[PDB]
Design a binder for these strands. Structure first.
Lengths: 86, 106, 122, 62, 59
RNA sequence: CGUGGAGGUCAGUGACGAAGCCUAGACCGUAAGGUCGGGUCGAACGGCCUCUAGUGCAGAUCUUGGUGGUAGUAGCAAAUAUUCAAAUGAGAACUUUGAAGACUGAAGUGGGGAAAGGUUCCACGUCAACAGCAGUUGGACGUGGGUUAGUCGAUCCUAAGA
């Protein structure tokens, strides 16, 4: 499980694209084996940010979704712009 | 022919013998029948304030006489009634007893 | 194509058909045999009068234990009814046939229904 | 149109049951577009939706 | 469209790994791109490239 | 007398139409059966000497499939009950809004859960079938969205028991 297996995709539904705007929260899809330590680590190392907390949930389709909140010194809009999707 | 008259419908004798559950749902049809006989039309619409005065006292509490006011009018586009209809409305009176039938001026 | 037995001239004619309809076979056979042989405008007037209970349809073969009426005298029966669904289907197919005849360029004032037939779907 | 959803959300925002909300009948095509609690909070604010006061149960006879 | 085995059969034991991480980064960004693009044929090439490298590494 | 297959012959019939099927049209035989004509149809099939057998049906409250009369017949009668106008729509007794009339009556036709179910939750569109009349409605049909815990549960402990 490298940090390229851990973080699988970003989630781009227009309900999720509002948390990045108001709540300052990046929504990700991670692997069914990662935990709230590895998710924090992988995000921090890939985008050089300050993670405040991570919440997770195993969806009915089968995969696992992460809610990663950032600190008041960063901007999820700009980080998602760098990743490309907005 | 546009025209407007006032009427007193004796509603006691048209409901005599009807089941209690169906007295107020039947004064409705009796009034439509009345208006069709008099104004000779086929489309009859009742103002929703005549519904209130028919149902004022429940299903089995219709009045004995009703003072009405009927108007024959011209119908609008997408009509199949060639081209008239009646609009029935209630009038306000102390009693509904002792009144003949008159013609309203406009 | 391949209609039932129709002895007539196929140049002065028009056709119309409908298959797999959710109607009653027994009721539709009577409202077909009722207008079988009439003129077009007369038949359409008749079917318009039936929908207002001004005239009836003589039930002549599928008629067990239905009730008698006074509108069966015009035809010579006592049993008669008013199948609305069947009358509507038949008076749609009739309008289709009339439009087809107009397309072929036939004279609408001379049109009589010369063949009409119903049978059972699966 | 179909204002079932708007009735439900309006009743949930005001704080009453579905039997105590009044959706104006002349402005149907404005409520047809209100599909968020924010839009409904605007409509209740201006007046297109009202609260329909409570039926009395007096105790004078008691 | 991809790597060649007789090419890879001489490269050093470190350029191989750096190639692996480059191809995996490429796939990672390609998933985010395909999150909007209709259909992309570079995926079937990059997967088989990763695999053709890992084979020689194992050998 | 007729049926499926096998050996021999008729240098047999055939896309210019083999077999099959329809035919109050015809000829032969006491009969079982055989041969012609016309319609449809589309690729194989007969006569004679012999060999062989899973070899011929009206019945078995026979087996499988299909179809009738009854018959538009019996029937669609529990839970007091609906009415007016507008809107949408091809189309409204049954959808949506407003107005009136009633009901459950806090041991509720209200607000939550355990087990069980498994997407039935929500939005958009839509009516071939289904919801025992209807339907523009729907837990139906098609396409997407949705479940966030140091403090609530499991996880830990032991009971009858294994």
């Amino acid at each position: 499980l490298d940090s390229y297996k851990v973080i699988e995709q970003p989630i781009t539904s227009e309900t999720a694209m509002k948390k990045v705007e108001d709540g300052n929260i990046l929504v990700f899809q991670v692997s069914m084996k990662a935990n709230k330590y590895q998710i924090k680590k992988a995000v921090k190392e890939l985008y050089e940010v300050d993670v405040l907390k991570v919440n997770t949930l195993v969806r009915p389709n089968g995969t696992k979704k992460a809610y990663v909140r950032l600190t008041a010194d960063y901007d999820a809009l700009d980080i998602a712009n760098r990743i490309g999707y907005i | 022919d546009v025209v407007t008259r006032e009427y007193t419908i004796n509603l006691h004798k048209r409901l005599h013998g009807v089941s209690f559950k169906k007295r107020a749902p039947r004064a409705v049809k009796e009034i439509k029948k009345f208006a069709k006989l008099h104004m000779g039309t086929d489309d009859v619409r009742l103002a929703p304030e005549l519904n209130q005065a028919i149902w004022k006292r429940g299903v089995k509490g219709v009045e004995y006489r009703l003072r009405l006011r009927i108007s024959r009018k011209r119908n609008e586009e997408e009509d199949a009634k060639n081209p008239l209809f009646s609009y029935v409305e209630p009038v306000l009176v102390a009693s509904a007893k002792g009144l003949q039938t008159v013609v309203v001026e406009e | 194509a391949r209609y039932g037995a129709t002895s007539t001239n196929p140049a002065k004619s028009a056709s119309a058909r409908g298959s797999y309809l959710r109607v009653s076979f027994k009721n539709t056979r009577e409202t077909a045999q009722a207008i079988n042989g009439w003129e077009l405008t007369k038949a359409q007037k008749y079917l318009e009068q039936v929908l207002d209970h001004q005239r009836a349809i003589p039930f002549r073969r599928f008629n067990s234990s239905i009730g008698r009426t006074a509108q069966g005298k015009e035809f010579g029966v006592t049993k008669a009814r008013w199948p609305a669904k069947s009358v509507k289907f038949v008076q749609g197919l009739l309008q289709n046939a009339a439009a087809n005849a107009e397309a072929k360029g036939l004279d609408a004032t001379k049109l009589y229904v010369s063949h009409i037939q119903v049978n059972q779907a699966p | 149109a179909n204002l079932r959803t708007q009735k439900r959300l309006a009743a949930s925002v005001v704080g009453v049951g579905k039997r105590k909300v009044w959706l104006d009948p002349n402005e149907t095509s404005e409520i047809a577009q209100a599909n968020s609690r924010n839009a409904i909070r605007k409509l209740v604010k201006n007046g297109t939706i009202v609260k329909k006061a409570v039926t009395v149960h007096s105790k004078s006879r008691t | 469209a991809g790597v060649k085995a007789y090419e890879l059969r001489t490269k050093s034991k470190e350029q191989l790994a750096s190639q692996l991480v480059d191809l995996k980064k490429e796939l990672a960004e390609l998933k985010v791109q395909k999150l909007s693009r209709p259909s992309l044929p570079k995926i079937k090439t990059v997967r088989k490239s990763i695999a053709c490298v890992l084979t020689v590494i194992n050998e």
